[PDB]
Design an enzyme around this catalytic site. Structure first.
Site, short mmCIF file in Angstrom:
data_model
loop_
_atom_site.label_atom_id
_atom_site.label_comp_id
_atom_site.label_asym_id
_atom_site.label_seq_id
_atom_site.Cartn_x
_atom_site.Cartn_y
_atom_site.Cartn_z
N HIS A 21 23.03 -12.17 24.04
CA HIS A 21 22.30 -13.43 23.98
C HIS A 21 22.08 -14.06 25.35
O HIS A 21 23.02 -14.17 26.15
CB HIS A 21 23.09 -14.40 23.10
CG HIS A 21 22.41 -15.71 22.88
ND1 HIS A 21 21.45 -15.89 21.91
CD2 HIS A 21 22.55 -16.90 23.51
CE1 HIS A 21 21.03 -17.14 21.95
NE2 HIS A 21 21.68 -17.77 22.91
N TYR A 59 16.07 -14.34 29.12
CA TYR A 59 16.12 -15.62 28.44
C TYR A 59 17.15 -16.62 28.98
O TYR A 59 17.46 -17.60 28.30
CB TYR A 59 16.31 -15.41 26.94
CG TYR A 59 15.22 -14.58 26.31
CD1 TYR A 59 14.02 -15.16 25.89
CD2 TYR A 59 15.36 -13.20 26.15
CE1 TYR A 59 13.00 -14.40 25.33
CE2 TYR A 59 14.35 -12.42 25.60
CZ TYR A 59 13.17 -13.02 25.18
OH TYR A 59 12.17 -12.25 24.62
N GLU A 142 15.09 -7.36 18.01
CA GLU A 142 15.51 -8.72 17.99
C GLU A 142 16.37 -8.92 16.75
O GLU A 142 15.99 -8.52 15.63
CB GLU A 142 14.29 -9.62 17.94
CG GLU A 142 14.61 -11.07 17.98
CD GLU A 142 13.37 -11.88 18.04
OE1 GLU A 142 12.74 -12.02 16.97
OE2 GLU A 142 13.02 -12.34 19.15
#
Lengths: 518, 41, 518, 41
Positions: A21, A59, A142
């Site tokens: 993550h 991210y 994902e």
């Protein structure tokens, strides 16, 4: 029909399912304690992770200042016990619920968290995690976790960019470069920052540079006359010993010409103003929508030519000195402070984005459905299956190739087809080109045993509003699979108009690469 | 004609004179492209 | 599984099934008495016809001299009684036989003629005719008749081109022009032949022309210096009153510049030789693989600008006078005889081929899967379904757009999305662009109620080896269908780099046109 | 800004200033294309 929306081949159960993550800045320490909850499709409310730590890294930037903020980090989250990964063939919640027979009146991810769903589709696991292809053009997936089931996750840190306290997002991109460095651009931006600074000052204190700096009209002038100054300044600046290696790798390719650095310098001068020049986000923002950057980046023909810290530094340094000369001639601000300051920072960031693109796997022009763009033409395989030539059986196969041209009517002289006698020969009659509906047959002829050449019976032109589909039909007489050594060429050569390349009249070759399979 | 006149024209490919068009051609080896099969990709 | 290879929607039975057949020259009278029989897939041995007489016309040329022979004609063949047209989803005989359960050890068309097949798949008819889509990009179909069943056909003549005794293939193309003339280029080539001849002689007897003809070095010279003469000759020649209208329609578009006619003239001179110059087939052959023809044809931007007999004649005339000046400067033959003779004939033929392409229905750049090629970029819908935006239901839909660039790294500033509030709005979270696997989210914002604008969070560049997929997600709140008057724009505007168009800084717009359906 | 400065820029389309990019834009009417929506197709 669960088989209609669930890709069972990619679905599976495993002990200690782990994923990654991307963690925004300021959330690196806090997230290491547990996953906690804080669109037009309420159904996908959930915690998102990915099977790739490098994508996950991407991210980790400020959602506030997305272009040039700082990086957070990546954490590895694991589920205790068993977890069912249900890969999905579609991302339409409504369609998924119908085919999976669920409450069409409640969000999807919430039903994925109920025991009813964990029982039926769980195949034993404690919870289920949805899996969809990360994106188009990627192998990563994902993972969509249910918010409730996700508190059960065990968060362990993988990397912390903010902890490296490195300029901009250097830490982050250094990490991503690892993906290939096990082309592959793995640069040391600290070094590049050093070398650039050193060179900018060296250029500034160089006789000829100062000499040319004086020939500068120094007040706003027409951009036509501005370029001419910058181009001259360029030739001069490029003579400097520090930039020796740039002068060399630059003299051949047109993209890297002084006229290109000149027009770039002017573009920058025209879009940056006092407001913009003061803000890093605002600057990088303006710069990123300008053309001609490949010129200073040394990127052209599918390759990053400025592959070293040394050359990269030299290019940026030169670009910065030029931008400084450009500003008074068409800009409207604090003349230079920007060029050695913000400009270098933004441009360094853009280099990093593009380098990251080339380090990522991708299909080159002419492969799978990627178009091959050459001499005004644009050809590509109609579908991915068309690019795949199967073997190990006796029989036919047909292959469609979309062909067209950007504007004026361009010809198609014919097509060169690689062959392996007995295992792969051209079916002379099932092979044709259709131009706007007009099916035109082709006169094929084995030039060698290695290649057949087909020529259209009636002239073939493609252009704006005139498209065509070349249909290559192959025939197999042996049911023996083609062996690697046999493959003497892996592409189909569509020939365009006749040009003169290095003194020899040859036809424009547009290539469609294929893969032999089965 | 590939022997005499068009020798060394093709870099990473096999030279084949295409009679119909009256010009040489280069059958690019696996992965190469270009009229002269100069580049890979 | 018959439903797997037989398209039942397009399959049907009818009384007096009629179709058309292109008849080669010399076979027009003979074929009017009965269909009689005379590849790598022995299965498709049979008599072929089509549902379109104009396509059928195309097949009336000498298979011997396909580029510039003479035309034969078209005949309408009808089957007495009932005929079953079995449209097929595939053209692989082996696959068809398996799914249709037939003798895998005998040809396909022969089994289609047996009573066993006519009984099972015939649904009552006396015989069966196979139907496959004519070609990719057409609505016409191809009828494959069994050789035996086809003697039962009743041949009646539709048109006979050879009977019109018109030059080249004029009769044939005049016929095909009818397809649209019920753009649509319907020219009178006789008139064009007249006007051209008259103008060529008028130019030759014009003072300035003769005056410039003398400034000609008349012996072989470098092509660089040759062009310069031809360009000057061009400017001069274009002054002639007969070519008044060409001088006007030519001064704006760059494609039609004198430099273009000049480089064309030189190309022609370089490829024609005594052998070639003597033969019509050989000439047209050489000419057809040369670029820059749109320049003399007046074709550019998806349009045939030289839409009149008058302008067409003027262009050909000028091109012929130029070619005559070009020959001594780099050619190697009987200096001129060719230019007014064979060159005019071949070029007239090529004009006819291209005009025929523009008269045929086709999808313009940006429609369905046709790429839109502008400023170095190449964008297009991933699939035909993507180009179709459905309405009349509440819910989502996603749309993939392939984007890439020819060489150096080009930016994508963002994208403009047309909207109809309540019936079609952007799903801000299901909308993104993925660049080489990197899924990048977008900051969308309704500028108006008529258009939303989405901008990538991190900079987006595409180029050789760097492709992207823009995924536009739409959302519908009303289940009422969008009405025509509501549609204020039918395309998605992908924005590229910032350029200056007519004094205003604007971004390169690459358009993907869509269709609202359901 | 479409009223004052960028008036008449858009031919067959509606002018919309795109703040983010600091430039006008033309939302081409059905069938038109071009930065200024000059052409049909």
């Amino acid at each position: 029909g669960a088989d209609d929306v669930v890709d069972s081949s990619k679905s599976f159960v495993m002990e200690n399912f782990s994923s990654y993550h991307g963690t925004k800045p300021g959330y690196v320490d806090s997230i290491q304690k547990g996953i906690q909850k804080p669109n037009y499709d309420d159904d996908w409310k959930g915690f998102y992770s990915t099977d790739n730590k490098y994508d996950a890294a991407g991210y980790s930037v400020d959602n506030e200042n997305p272009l040039s903020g700082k990086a957070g980090g990546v954490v590895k989250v694991t589920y205790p016990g068993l977890t069912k990964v249900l890969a999905l063939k579609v991302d339409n919640a409504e369609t998924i619920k119908k085919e999976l027979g669920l409450s069409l009146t409640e969000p999807l991810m919430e039903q994925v968290g109920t025991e009813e769903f964990i029982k039926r589709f769980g195949d034993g696991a404690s919870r289920v995690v949805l899996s969809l292809p990360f994106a188009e053009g990627s192998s990563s997936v994902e993972y969509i976790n249910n918010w409730e089931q996700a508190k059960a996750l065990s968060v362990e840190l993988e990397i912390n960019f903010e902890t490296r306290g490195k300029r901009g997002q250097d830490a982050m991109y250094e990490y991503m470069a690892q993906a290939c460095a096990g082309s592959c651009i793995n640069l040391d931006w600290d070094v590049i920052r050093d070398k650039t600074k050193t060179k900018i000052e060296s250029l500034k204190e160089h006789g000829p540079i100062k000499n040319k700096m004086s020939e500068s009209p120094n007040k706003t002038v027409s951009e036509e006359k501005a370029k001419q100054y910058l181009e001259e300044f360029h030739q001069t600046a490029l003579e400097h010993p520090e930039l020796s290696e740039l002068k060399t790798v630059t003299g051949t390719n047109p993209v890297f010409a002084g006229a290109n650095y000149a027009a770039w310098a002017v573009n920058v001068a025209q879009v940056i103003d006092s407001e913009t020049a003061d803000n890093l986000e605002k600057t990088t923002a303006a710069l990123s929508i300008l053309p001609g950057i490949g010129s200073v980046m040394g990127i052209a023909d599918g390759a990053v030519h400025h592959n070293t810290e040394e050359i990269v530094a030299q290019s940026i340094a030169l670009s910065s000195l030029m931008v400084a000369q450009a500003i008074p001639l068409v800009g409207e601000l604090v003349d230079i402070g920007f060029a050695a300051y913000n400009f270098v920072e933004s441009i360094i960031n853009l280099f990093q984005v593009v380098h990251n693109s080339y380090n990522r796997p991708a299909y080159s022009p002419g492969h799978k459905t990627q178009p091959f763009l050459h001499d005004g033409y644009a050809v590509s395989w109609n579908t991915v299956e068309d690019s795949i030539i199967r073997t190990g059986f006796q029989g036919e196969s047909g292959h469609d190739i979309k062909i067209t041209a950007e504007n004026t009517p361009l010809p198609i002289a014919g097509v060169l087809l690689p062959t392996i006698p007995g295992k792969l020969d051209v079916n002379k009659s099932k092979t044709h080109i259709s131009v706007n509906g007009r099916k035109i047959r082709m006169r094929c002829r084995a030039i060698d045993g290695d290649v057949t050449f087909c020529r259209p019976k009636s002239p073939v032109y493609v252009g704006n509003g005139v498209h065509a589909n070349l249909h290559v039909a192959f025939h197999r007489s042996s049911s023996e699979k083609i062996h690697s050594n046999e493959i003497s060429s892996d592409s189909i050569g569509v020939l365009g108009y006749q040009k003169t390349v290095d003194h020899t009249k040859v036809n424009s070759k547009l290539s469609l690469f294929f893969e032999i399979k089965s | 004609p590939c022997l005499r006149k068009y020798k060394d024209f093709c870099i990473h490919g096999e030279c084949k004179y295409v009679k119909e068009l009256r010009a040489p051609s280069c059958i690019c080896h696996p992965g190469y492209h270009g009229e002269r099969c100069h580049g890979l990709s």
